[PDB]
Protein backbone atom coordinates (compact mmCIF):
# COMPACT_ATOMS: atom_id res chain seq x y z
CA UNK A 1 0.00 0.00 0.00
CA UNK A 2 2.10 2.92 -1.31
CA UNK A 3 0.36 6.29 -1.61
CA UNK A 4 0.10 9.97 -0.62
CA UNK A 5 -1.01 11.57 2.69
CA UNK A 6 -4.48 13.18 2.68
CA UNK A 7 -3.37 16.15 4.90
CA UNK A 8 0.11 16.88 3.49
CA UNK A 9 0.62 14.67 0.34
CA UNK A 10 3.95 13.30 1.82
CA UNK A 11 4.43 9.72 0.48
CA UNK A 12 3.68 7.00 3.12
CA UNK A 13 2.97 3.31 3.62
CA UNK A 14 0.61 4.17 6.60
CA UNK A 15 -3.29 4.24 6.44
CA UNK A 16 -5.74 4.72 9.34
CA UNK A 17 -7.41 1.40 10.14
CA UNK A 18 -10.27 2.91 12.17
CA UNK A 19 -11.19 5.45 9.43
CA UNK A 20 -14.03 3.88 7.32
CA UNK A 21 -12.26 5.19 4.17
CA UNK A 22 -8.63 4.08 5.19
CA UNK A 23 -6.85 7.43 4.37
CA UNK A 24 -3.08 7.37 3.72
CA UNK A 25 -1.46 9.40 6.55
CA UNK A 26 2.15 10.53 6.76
CA UNK A 27 4.29 9.80 9.85
CA UNK A 28 3.78 13.36 11.33
CA UNK A 29 0.00 13.43 10.63
CA UNK A 30 -0.80 9.75 11.42
CA UNK A 31 0.60 10.46 14.94
CA UNK A 32 -1.40 13.70 15.19
CA UNK A 33 -4.48 11.59 14.31
CA UNK A 34 -4.06 8.52 16.62
CA UNK A 35 -2.92 10.67 19.59
CA UNK A 36 -6.08 12.91 19.44
CA UNK A 37 -8.90 10.43 18.49
CA UNK A 38 -10.27 6.94 19.44
CA UNK A 39 -8.68 5.76 16.12
CA UNK A 40 -5.60 3.69 17.07
CA UNK A 41 -5.43 0.94 14.42
CA UNK A 42 -2.65 1.78 11.88
CA UNK A 43 -2.21 -0.21 8.57
CA UNK A 44 1.00 -0.16 6.46
CA UNK A 45 1.89 -3.42 4.48
CA UNK A 46 1.16 -5.37 7.76
CA UNK A 47 -1.06 -3.94 10.53
CA UNK A 48 0.62 -2.36 13.47
CA UNK A 49 -0.69 -5.05 15.84
CA UNK A 50 1.27 -7.20 18.41
CA UNK A 51 3.18 -10.08 16.81
CA UNK A 52 3.24 -12.15 20.04
CA UNK A 53 0.98 -15.25 19.64
CA UNK A 54 -2.61 -14.61 20.84
CA UNK A 55 -1.91 -11.01 21.84
CA UNK A 56 -4.79 -8.58 21.24
CA UNK A 57 -2.86 -5.25 21.44
CA UNK A 58 -3.75 -3.12 18.32
CA UNK A 59 -3.43 0.45 19.79
CA UNK A 60 -0.39 2.06 18.04
CA UNK A 61 0.52 4.08 21.23
CA UNK A 62 0.86 0.77 23.19
CA UNK A 63 3.23 -0.73 20.50
CA UNK A 64 7.02 -0.91 19.69
CA UNK A 65 9.41 -2.10 16.86
CA UNK A 66 11.45 -5.11 18.00
CA UNK A 67 14.02 -5.53 15.26
CA UNK A 68 11.76 -6.10 12.25
CA UNK A 69 8.43 -6.92 14.04
CA UNK A 70 5.82 -5.05 16.21
CA UNK A 71 5.12 -5.85 19.92
CA UNK A 72 3.27 -4.35 22.91
CA UNK A 73 4.88 -3.26 26.28
CA UNK A 74 4.33 -6.91 27.53
CA UNK A 75 6.09 -8.67 24.59
CA UNK A 76 8.67 -6.13 23.31
CA UNK A 77 12.36 -7.17 23.29
CA UNK A 78 15.03 -5.06 25.16
CA UNK A 79 16.04 -3.33 21.91
CA UNK A 80 12.65 -1.88 20.91
CA UNK A 81 11.70 1.63 19.82
CA UNK A 82 8.12 2.91 20.50
CA UNK A 83 6.07 3.38 17.33
CA UNK A 84 4.67 6.62 18.91
CA UNK A 85 7.29 9.16 19.96
CA UNK A 86 8.46 12.68 18.96
CA UNK A 87 5.23 13.52 17.09
CA UNK A 88 5.76 10.63 14.64
CA UNK A 89 4.66 7.00 13.87
CA UNK A 90 7.42 4.78 12.35
CA UNK A 91 6.67 4.44 8.65
CA UNK A 92 8.35 4.55 5.25
CA UNK A 93 9.40 7.96 3.86
CA UNK A 94 9.69 10.00 7.10
CA UNK A 95 -5.26 18.53 11.14
CA UNK A 96 -7.84 19.10 13.96
CA UNK A 97 -10.37 19.37 11.04
CA UNK A 98 -9.33 15.97 9.61
CA UNK A 99 -9.93 14.40 13.06
CA UNK A 100 -13.43 15.89 13.27
CA UNK A 101 -14.39 14.65 9.72
CA UNK A 102 -12.86 11.20 10.46
CA UNK A 103 -14.89 10.68 13.70
CA UNK A 104 -18.24 12.55 13.32
CA UNK A 105 -21.51 10.62 12.70
CA UNK A 106 -22.72 13.28 10.10
CA UNK A 107 -25.90 14.00 12.10
CA UNK A 108 -25.02 17.66 13.04
CA UNK A 109 -24.89 20.79 10.82
CA UNK A 110 -21.37 21.65 12.07
CA UNK A 111 -20.13 18.43 10.38
CA UNK A 112 -21.22 19.72 6.94
CA UNK A 113 -19.92 23.27 7.74
CA UNK A 114 -16.49 21.73 8.34
CA UNK A 115 -16.67 19.47 5.18
CA UNK A 116 -16.93 22.77 3.20
CA UNK A 117 -14.54 25.15 5.05
CA UNK A 118 -11.59 22.67 5.06
CA UNK A 119 -8.79 22.17 2.42
CA UNK A 120 -9.58 20.67 -1.00
CA UNK A 121 -8.15 17.20 -0.20
CA UNK A 122 -10.17 17.22 3.06
CA UNK A 123 -13.34 18.17 1.16
CA UNK A 124 -12.89 14.97 -0.96
CA UNK A 125 -12.15 12.89 2.19
CA UNK A 126 -15.29 14.40 3.85
CA UNK A 127 -17.52 13.66 0.81
CA UNK A 128 -16.12 10.10 0.47
CA UNK A 129 -16.67 9.43 4.25
CA UNK A 130 -20.18 10.99 4.36
CA UNK A 131 -21.35 9.01 1.33
CA UNK A 132 -19.95 5.76 2.78
CA UNK A 133 -21.74 6.50 6.11
CA UNK A 134 -25.03 7.36 4.31
CA UNK A 135 -24.92 3.98 2.45
CA UNK A 136 -24.20 1.94 5.60
CA UNK A 137 -27.17 3.64 7.33
CA UNK A 138 -29.47 2.25 4.57
CA UNK A 139 -28.52 -1.30 5.78
CA UNK A 140 -29.94 -0.50 9.29
CA UNK A 141 -33.56 -0.40 7.92
CA UNK A 142 -35.85 -3.46 7.84
CA UNK A 143 -36.95 -5.55 4.80
CA UNK A 144 -40.60 -5.15 3.48
CA UNK A 145 -41.96 -8.61 2.40
CA UNK A 146 -45.24 -8.39 0.32
CA UNK A 147 -48.06 -9.90 2.40
CA UNK A 148 -50.71 -9.26 -0.42
CA UNK A 149 -51.88 -7.38 -3.68
CA UNK A 150 -55.03 -5.18 -4.00
CA UNK A 151 -54.84 -3.93 -7.59
CA UNK A 152 -52.38 -2.44 -10.23
CA UNK A 153 -51.49 0.60 -8.07
CA UNK A 154 -52.07 -0.57 -4.44
CA UNK A 155 -50.60 -3.20 -2.01
CA UNK A 156 -50.03 -4.14 1.73
CA UNK A 157 -46.54 -4.96 3.24
CA UNK A 158 -45.02 -6.87 6.23
CA UNK A 159 -42.10 -5.11 8.00
CA UNK A 160 -39.04 -6.54 9.77
CA UNK A 161 -39.22 -6.57 13.58
CA UNK A 162 -36.39 -4.94 15.57
CA UNK A 163 -35.02 -2.99 12.59
CA UNK A 164 -36.66 0.45 12.15
CA UNK A 165 -39.02 1.28 9.24
CA UNK A 166 -37.69 3.78 6.59
CA UNK A 167 -40.03 6.78 5.79
CA UNK A 168 -42.56 6.22 2.93
CA UNK A 169 -42.06 8.91 0.23
CA UNK A 170 -40.64 8.87 -3.35
CA UNK A 171 -37.30 10.08 -1.79
CA UNK A 172 -36.42 6.53 -0.52
CA UNK A 173 -36.21 4.15 -3.56
CA UNK A 174 -36.34 0.44 -2.81
CA UNK A 175 -35.06 -2.37 -5.03
CA UNK A 176 -37.63 -5.10 -5.60
CA UNK A 177 -36.86 -8.85 -5.33
CA UNK A 178 -34.65 -8.59 -9.02
CA UNK A 179 -38.12 -7.08 -10.05
CA UNK A 180 -36.63 -3.56 -10.52
CA UNK A 181 -36.69 -0.38 -8.44
CA UNK A 182 -40.00 0.58 -6.73
CA UNK A 183 -41.47 3.71 -4.99
CA UNK A 184 -44.26 4.05 -2.26
CA UNK A 185 -46.85 6.63 -1.07
CA UNK A 186 -49.08 6.35 2.05
CA UNK A 187 -52.85 0.41 6.12
CA UNK A 188 -53.51 1.34 2.40
CA UNK A 189 -50.32 2.16 0.43
CA UNK A 190 -49.77 3.07 -3.26
CA UNK A 191 -47.06 0.87 -4.99
CA UNK A 192 -45.07 2.10 -8.06
CA UNK A 193 -42.57 0.09 -10.11
CA UNK A 194 -39.93 1.47 -12.45
CA UNK A 195 -40.68 -1.80 -14.39
CA UNK A 196 -44.36 -2.91 -14.92
CA UNK A 197 -44.72 -6.10 -12.90
CA UNK A 198 -47.76 -8.03 -11.64
CA UNK A 199 -47.06 -7.66 -7.86
CA UNK A 200 -45.75 -11.02 -6.46
CA UNK A 201 -46.90 -11.95 -2.93
CA UNK A 202 -43.86 -13.01 -0.90
CA UNK A 203 -41.33 -10.91 -2.86
CA UNK A 204 -39.40 -8.28 -0.85
CA UNK A 205 -38.01 -4.72 -1.28
CA UNK A 206 -34.52 -3.50 -0.05
CA UNK A 207 -32.97 0.10 -0.26
CA UNK A 208 -30.18 -0.57 -2.78
CA UNK A 209 -26.82 0.67 -1.47
CA UNK A 210 -24.43 1.80 -4.22
CA UNK A 211 -20.71 1.32 -3.53
CA UNK A 212 -19.01 4.67 -2.75
CA UNK A 213 -16.05 5.10 -5.05
CA UNK A 214 -13.01 7.19 -4.05
CA UNK A 215 -12.75 10.82 -5.07
CA UNK A 216 -9.61 11.88 -6.99
CA UNK A 217 -10.50 15.14 -8.80
CA UNK A 218 -11.14 18.39 -6.81
CA UNK A 219 -14.73 19.72 -6.31
CA UNK A 220 -13.56 22.93 -8.10
CA UNK A 221 -10.54 22.92 -10.45
CA UNK A 222 -7.92 25.68 -9.76
CA UNK A 223 -9.20 28.97 -11.28
CA UNK A 224 -7.50 30.43 -14.36
CA UNK A 225 -8.07 33.93 -15.63
CA UNK A 226 -7.32 34.63 -19.26
CA UNK A 227 -6.85 37.87 -21.26
CA UNK A 228 -8.70 36.40 -24.32
CA UNK A 229 -11.43 33.82 -25.01
CA UNK A 230 -9.57 30.46 -24.93
CA UNK A 231 -10.27 27.49 -27.25
CA UNK A 232 -13.69 28.89 -28.09
CA UNK A 233 -14.69 30.79 -31.23
CA UNK A 234 -17.53 33.37 -30.94
CA UNK A 235 -20.03 34.46 -33.66
CA UNK A 236 -20.50 38.04 -34.77
CA UNK A 237 -23.98 37.12 -36.15
CA UNK A 238 -25.65 36.33 -32.78
CA UNK A 239 -29.50 36.58 -32.55
CA UNK A 240 -30.79 39.59 -30.54
CA UNK A 241 -32.65 36.98 -28.36
CA UNK A 242 -29.27 36.22 -26.64
CA UNK A 243 -27.76 39.75 -26.99
CA UNK A 244 -28.42 40.29 -23.26
CA UNK A 245 -25.91 37.56 -22.36
CA UNK A 246 -23.08 38.46 -24.83
CA UNK A 247 -20.79 40.14 -22.24
CA UNK A 248 -21.32 37.16 -19.84
CA UNK A 249 -20.64 34.54 -22.61
CA UNK A 250 -17.28 36.33 -23.15
CA UNK A 251 -16.58 36.23 -19.35
CA UNK A 252 -17.19 32.40 -19.71
CA UNK A 253 -14.31 32.16 -22.32
CA UNK A 254 -11.90 34.31 -20.25
CA UNK A 255 -11.97 32.14 -17.07
CA UNK A 256 -11.45 28.36 -16.42
CA UNK A 257 -14.73 28.19 -14.43
CA UNK A 258 -17.60 30.66 -13.85
CA UNK A 259 -20.58 30.91 -11.46
CA UNK A 260 -24.09 32.02 -12.45
CA UNK A 261 -26.68 32.89 -9.80
CA UNK A 262 -30.10 32.92 -11.38
CA UNK A 263 -33.10 33.45 -9.10
CA UNK A 264 -36.36 31.73 -10.32
CA UNK A 265 -37.40 32.67 -13.87
CA UNK A 266 -34.39 34.92 -14.65
CA UNK A 267 -33.20 32.95 -17.72
CA UNK A 268 -30.80 30.18 -16.63
CA UNK A 269 -31.85 27.61 -19.27
CA UNK A 270 -31.89 30.38 -21.93
CA UNK A 271 -28.33 31.45 -20.86
CA UNK A 272 -27.10 27.85 -20.89
CA UNK A 273 -28.51 27.12 -24.44
CA UNK A 274 -27.48 30.53 -25.81
CA UNK A 275 -23.88 29.87 -24.85
CA UNK A 276 -23.99 27.08 -27.61
CA UNK A 277 -25.21 29.58 -30.22
CA UNK A 278 -22.44 32.03 -29.13
CA UNK A 279 -19.59 29.43 -29.44
CA UNK A 280 -21.18 27.50 -32.31
CA UNK A 281 -18.41 24.96 -33.02
CA UNK A 282 -17.78 24.21 -29.29
CA UNK A 283 -18.75 20.73 -27.96
CA UNK A 284 -20.92 21.28 -24.85
CA UNK A 285 -21.75 18.78 -22.19
CA UNK A 286 -24.90 19.70 -20.25
CA UNK A 287 -25.11 18.09 -16.82
CA UNK A 288 -27.21 18.17 -13.61
CA UNK A 289 -27.92 15.77 -10.67
CA UNK A 290 -31.56 15.03 -11.51
CA UNK A 291 -33.15 13.60 -14.65
CA UNK A 292 -35.71 16.49 -14.57
CA UNK A 293 -32.97 19.17 -14.65
CA UNK A 294 -31.25 17.43 -17.61
CA UNK A 295 -34.72 17.07 -19.36
CA UNK A 296 -35.44 20.81 -18.80
CA UNK A 297 -32.09 21.64 -20.60
CA UNK A 298 -33.11 19.21 -23.47
CA UNK A 299 -36.46 21.09 -23.85
CA UNK A 300 -34.62 24.41 -24.32
CA UNK A 301 -32.00 22.87 -26.67
CA UNK A 302 -34.77 21.27 -28.80
CA UNK A 303 -36.05 24.83 -29.55
CA UNK A 304 -32.66 26.51 -30.52
CA UNK A 305 -29.99 23.84 -31.26
CA UNK A 306 -29.94 21.33 -34.17
CA UNK A 307 -31.69 18.07 -33.08
CA UNK A 308 -28.94 15.99 -34.85
CA UNK A 309 -25.99 17.03 -32.71
CA UNK A 310 -28.03 16.39 -29.53
CA UNK A 311 -27.79 13.21 -27.54
CA UNK A 312 -29.55 12.32 -24.26
CA UNK A 313 -27.40 9.80 -22.24
CA UNK A 314 -29.55 7.26 -20.39
CA UNK A 315 -27.88 4.84 -17.91
CA UNK A 316 -28.47 1.21 -19.07
CA UNK A 317 -30.20 0.71 -15.66
CA UNK A 318 -33.10 3.12 -16.43
CA UNK A 319 -35.11 4.15 -13.34
CA UNK A 320 -37.44 7.06 -14.35
CA UNK A 321 -38.91 8.27 -17.69
CA UNK A 322 -36.84 11.01 -19.31
CA UNK A 323 -36.37 12.93 -22.67
CA UNK A 324 -37.22 10.88 -25.83
CA UNK A 325 -36.59 13.42 -28.65
CA UNK A 326 -32.74 13.13 -29.07
CA UNK A 327 -30.69 10.18 -30.47
CA UNK A 328 -30.05 8.21 -27.18
CA UNK A 329 -26.53 7.23 -25.84
CA UNK A 330 -24.54 8.71 -28.76
CA UNK A 331 -21.64 9.94 -26.53
CA UNK A 332 -19.82 11.58 -29.50
CA UNK A 333 -22.57 14.15 -30.41
CA UNK A 334 -21.65 17.86 -30.17
CA UNK A 335 -24.32 18.47 -27.46
CA UNK A 336 -24.53 15.85 -24.76
CA UNK A 337 -27.20 16.00 -22.08
CA UNK A 338 -26.56 13.64 -19.15
CA UNK A 339 -27.00 13.31 -15.33
CA UNK A 340 -23.77 13.37 -13.16
CA UNK A 341 -24.14 9.63 -12.14
CA UNK A 342 -24.31 8.56 -15.87
CA UNK A 343 -21.48 10.76 -17.33
CA UNK A 344 -19.06 8.93 -19.59
CA UNK A 345 -15.27 9.52 -19.56
CA UNK A 346 -14.99 12.25 -22.17
CA UNK A 347 -13.62 15.78 -22.87
CA UNK A 348 -15.46 19.01 -23.79
CA UNK A 349 -14.95 22.63 -24.93
CA UNK A 350 -17.56 23.74 -22.31
CA UNK A 351 -19.26 21.83 -19.49
CA UNK A 352 -22.48 23.33 -18.11
CA UNK A 353 -23.57 22.10 -14.62
CA UNK A 354 -27.16 23.31 -13.86
CA UNK A 355 -29.22 23.30 -10.54
CA UNK A 356 -25.90 23.77 -8.62
CA UNK A 357 -27.67 24.18 -5.22
CA UNK A 358 -28.71 20.44 -5.58
CA UNK A 359 -25.12 19.25 -6.04
CA UNK A 360 -22.97 17.81 -3.24
CA UNK A 361 -19.14 18.02 -3.20
CA UNK A 362 -19.19 14.29 -4.19
CA UNK A 363 -21.09 15.25 -7.45
CA UNK A 364 -18.75 18.28 -8.01
CA UNK A 365 -15.69 15.96 -7.77
CA UNK A 366 -17.23 13.22 -10.04
CA UNK A 367 -17.85 15.82 -12.76
CA UNK A 368 -14.18 17.00 -12.60
CA UNK A 369 -13.06 13.31 -12.82
CA UNK A 370 -15.27 12.14 -15.78
CA UNK A 371 -15.09 15.40 -17.83
CA UNK A 372 -11.90 17.29 -18.89
CA UNK A 373 -13.03 20.70 -20.19
CA UNK A 374 -11.59 24.03 -21.40
CA UNK A 375 -14.39 25.92 -19.52
CA UNK A 376 -16.78 24.95 -16.72
CA UNK A 377 -20.04 26.84 -16.05
CA UNK A 378 -21.92 26.39 -12.77
CA UNK A 379 -25.53 27.50 -12.98
CA UNK A 380 -27.99 27.60 -10.09
CA UNK A 381 -29.11 29.64 -7.08
CA UNK A 382 -28.00 29.19 -3.42
CA UNK A 383 -31.46 30.57 -2.40
CA UNK A 384 -33.15 27.42 -3.78
CA UNK A 385 -33.22 23.87 -2.36
CA UNK A 386 -30.11 21.81 -1.63
CA UNK A 387 -29.70 18.01 -1.91
CA UNK A 388 -31.43 16.24 1.04
CA UNK A 389 -28.82 15.24 3.65
CA UNK A 390 -30.37 12.01 4.97
CA UNK A 391 -28.15 11.64 8.08
CA UNK A 392 -28.56 15.30 9.08
CA UNK A 393 -31.03 15.65 12.02
CA UNK A 394 -29.50 18.35 14.28
CA UNK A 395 -28.99 21.94 13.16
CA UNK A 396 -29.75 23.77 9.92
CA UNK A 397 -27.48 23.84 6.83
CA UNK A 398 -26.97 27.37 5.44
CA UNK A 399 -26.57 27.99 1.60
CA UNK A 400 -22.84 28.79 1.90
CA UNK A 401 -22.40 25.17 3.09
CA UNK A 402 -24.38 23.33 0.25
CA UNK A 403 -21.27 22.79 -1.90
CA UNK A 404 -18.00 24.58 -2.98
CA UNK A 405 -19.80 26.53 -5.74
CA UNK A 406 -22.55 27.75 -3.31
CA UNK A 407 -19.83 28.63 -0.81
CA UNK A 408 -18.24 30.92 -3.43
CA UNK A 409 -21.61 32.44 -4.57
CA UNK A 410 -22.53 33.29 -0.94
CA UNK A 411 -19.12 34.67 0.17
CA UNK A 412 -17.25 36.34 -2.81
CA UNK A 413 -20.51 36.59 -4.86
CA UNK A 414 -21.34 34.91 -8.16
CA UNK A 415 -19.38 35.77 -11.36
CA UNK A 416 -22.70 36.48 -13.16
CA UNK A 417 -26.19 37.37 -11.74
CA UNK A 418 -29.52 37.24 -13.75
CA UNK A 419 -31.40 40.07 -12.01
CA UNK A 420 -34.77 40.19 -13.79
CA UNK A 421 -37.43 37.62 -13.00
CA UNK A 422 -39.64 37.28 -16.08
CA UNK A 423 -41.98 34.59 -14.66
CA UNK A 424 -43.70 35.79 -11.53
CA UNK A 425 -46.26 38.50 -10.79
CA UNK A 426 -44.60 41.50 -9.01
CA UNK A 427 -46.17 40.57 -5.55
CA UNK A 428 -44.14 37.32 -5.58
CA UNK A 429 -40.94 38.96 -6.99
CA UNK A 430 -40.98 41.75 -4.35
CA UNK A 431 -41.42 39.11 -1.55
CA UNK A 432 -38.50 36.78 -2.52
CA UNK A 433 -36.22 39.73 -3.52
CA UNK A 434 -36.48 41.08 0.07
CA UNK A 435 -36.46 37.58 1.62
CA UNK A 436 -33.42 35.90 -0.02
CA UNK A 437 -31.91 38.25 -2.69
CA UNK A 438 -31.12 41.49 -0.68
CA UNK A 439 -33.49 43.48 -2.91
CA UNK A 440 -31.46 42.85 -6.12
CA UNK A 441 -34.11 40.75 -7.94
CA UNK A 442 -36.42 42.95 -10.05
CA UNK A 443 -39.95 42.32 -11.45
CA UNK A 444 -40.48 42.26 -15.20
CA UNK A 445 -44.22 41.40 -14.87
CA UNK A 446 -46.71 43.80 -13.28
CA UNK A 447 -48.63 42.82 -10.07
CA UNK A 448 -51.24 40.22 -11.19
CA UNK A 449 -53.65 41.08 -8.25
CA UNK A 450 -54.07 37.26 -8.02
CA UNK A 451 -51.68 36.73 -5.05
CA UNK A 452 -53.50 35.95 -1.85
CA UNK A 453 -52.36 35.02 1.65
CA UNK A 454 -54.52 33.63 4.50
CA UNK A 455 -53.42 33.22 8.07
CA UNK A 456 -54.91 29.89 9.22
CA UNK A 457 -53.10 27.48 11.62
CA UNK A 458 -55.84 24.77 11.28
CA UNK A 459 -55.18 21.38 12.92
CA UNK A 460 -51.95 19.45 12.52
CA UNK A 461 -52.21 15.69 12.37
CA UNK A 462 -49.25 13.39 11.45
CA UNK A 463 -48.88 10.33 9.14
CA UNK A 464 -45.90 9.08 11.19
CA UNK A 465 -43.71 12.32 10.88
CA UNK A 466 -45.04 13.72 7.54
CA UNK A 467 -47.74 16.26 8.47
CA UNK A 468 -51.38 16.74 7.39
CA UNK A 469 -53.57 19.87 7.92
CA UNK A 470 -57.17 19.01 6.89
CA UNK A 471 -58.66 22.43 7.93
CA UNK A 472 -56.09 24.07 5.50
CA UNK A 473 -57.31 21.77 2.66
CA UNK A 474 -60.91 22.63 3.72
CA UNK A 475 -60.12 26.35 3.43
CA UNK A 476 -58.73 25.69 -0.14
CA UNK A 477 -61.93 23.73 -1.00
CA UNK A 478 -64.14 26.71 0.08
CA UNK A 479 -61.92 29.15 -1.89
CA UNK A 480 -62.16 26.89 -5.00
CA UNK A 481 -66.00 26.96 -4.96
CA UNK A 482 -65.85 30.84 -5.04
CA UNK A 483 -62.94 31.14 -7.48
CA UNK A 484 -63.32 28.29 -10.03
CA UNK A 485 -60.67 29.92 -12.28
CA UNK A 486 -58.21 28.33 -9.73
CA UNK A 487 -59.53 24.84 -10.83
CA UNK A 488 -56.47 24.61 -13.11
CA UNK A 489 -54.00 25.32 -10.16
CA UNK A 490 -51.21 22.97 -8.90
CA UNK A 491 -51.45 22.18 -5.15
CA UNK A 492 -48.09 22.60 -3.33
CA UNK A 493 -47.11 21.85 0.30
CA UNK A 494 -43.91 20.85 2.16
CA UNK A 495 -45.34 17.34 2.91
CA UNK A 496 -46.24 14.40 0.67
CA UNK A 497 -48.94 13.32 3.20
CA UNK A 498 -50.64 16.74 3.03
CA UNK A 499 -50.50 16.41 -0.83
CA UNK A 500 -52.13 12.91 -0.69
CA UNK A 501 -55.08 14.22 1.36
CA UNK A 502 -55.38 17.28 -0.94
CA UNK A 503 -55.24 15.17 -4.12
CA UNK A 504 -58.24 13.13 -2.91
CA UNK A 505 -60.27 16.13 -1.41
CA UNK A 506 -59.45 18.82 -4.05
CA UNK A 507 -58.64 16.71 -7.10
CA UNK A 508 -55.85 19.25 -8.01
CA UNK A 509 -52.48 17.97 -9.28
CA UNK A 510 -50.03 17.71 -6.37
CA UNK A 511 -46.35 18.63 -5.93
CA UNK A 512 -44.11 19.00 -2.84
CA UNK A 513 -41.99 22.22 -2.74
CA UNK A 514 -38.85 20.06 -3.35
CA UNK A 515 -40.33 18.33 -6.43
CA UNK A 516 -41.74 21.64 -7.82
CA UNK A 517 -38.24 23.25 -8.10
CA UNK A 518 -37.37 24.06 -11.73
CA UNK A 519 -41.10 23.96 -12.75
CA UNK A 520 -43.66 26.74 -13.35
CA UNK A 521 -47.48 26.83 -13.29
CA UNK A 522 -50.07 29.63 -13.98
CA UNK A 523 -51.71 29.04 -10.62
CA UNK A 524 -50.31 27.66 -7.40
CA UNK A 525 -52.18 26.86 -4.18
CA UNK A 526 -49.75 26.49 -1.26
CA UNK A 527 -50.69 25.23 2.25
CA UNK A 528 -47.80 25.64 4.74
CA UNK A 529 -49.26 22.69 6.81
CA UNK A 530 -46.99 23.11 9.92
CA UNK A 531 -44.97 25.87 11.63
CA UNK A 532 -41.76 23.65 11.74
CA UNK A 533 -38.17 24.53 10.65
CA UNK A 534 -38.83 22.49 7.42
CA UNK A 535 -41.96 24.42 6.43
CA UNK A 536 -40.46 27.79 7.59
CA UNK A 537 -37.19 27.26 5.61
CA UNK A 538 -36.67 30.44 3.55
CA UNK A 539 -35.08 28.55 0.58
CA UNK A 540 -38.10 26.18 0.44
CA UNK A 541 -40.45 29.18 0.87
CA UNK A 542 -38.69 31.02 -2.00
CA UNK A 543 -39.13 27.95 -4.29
CA UNK A 544 -42.79 27.47 -3.19
CA UNK A 545 -44.04 30.98 -4.08
CA UNK A 546 -41.79 31.39 -7.23
CA UNK A 547 -43.55 28.47 -9.11
CA UNK A 548 -46.49 30.83 -10.10
CA UNK A 549 -46.71 32.76 -13.39
CA UNK A 550 -50.18 34.25 -12.77
CA UNK A 551 -51.51 33.72 -9.25
CA UNK A 552 -50.93 32.09 -5.87
CA UNK A 553 -52.99 31.37 -2.74
CA UNK A 554 -50.81 30.90 0.41
CA UNK A 555 -52.55 29.40 3.49
CA UNK A 556 -49.89 30.19 6.18
CA UNK A 557 -49.05 28.81 9.66
CA UNK A 558 -45.99 31.06 10.44
CA UNK A 559 -46.80 34.72 11.38
CA UNK A 560 -43.26 35.77 10.22
CA UNK A 561 -43.47 34.45 6.60
CA UNK A 562 -47.20 35.44 6.48
CA UNK A 563 -46.17 39.09 7.27
CA UNK A 564 -43.34 38.96 4.70
CA UNK A 565 -45.79 37.91 1.91
CA UNK A 566 -46.63 41.12 -0.09
CA UNK A 567 -49.99 39.62 -1.12
CA UNK A 568 -53.65 40.58 -0.75
CA UNK A 569 -54.92 39.09 2.55
CA UNK A 570 -58.19 37.08 2.46
CA UNK A 571 -60.63 36.22 5.31
CA UNK A 572 -63.00 33.28 6.30
Ligand SMILES: [Zn+2]
Nearest residue numbers: 005008026029
Ligand atom coordinates in the same frame (compact mmCIF):
# COMPACT_ATOMS: atom_id res chain seq x y z
ZN1 LIG B 1 0.90 14.83 6.83
Ligand SMILES: [Zn+2]
Nearest residue numbers: 016018019039
Ligand atom coordinates in the same frame (compact mmCIF):
# COMPACT_ATOMS: atom_id res chain seq x y z
ZN1 LIG C 1 -8.94 7.43 11.63
Ligand SMILES: [Zn+2]
Nearest residue numbers: 050055072075
Ligand atom coordinates in the same frame (compact mmCIF):
# COMPACT_ATOMS: atom_id res chain seq x y z
ZN1 LIG D 1 1.61 -8.35 22.98
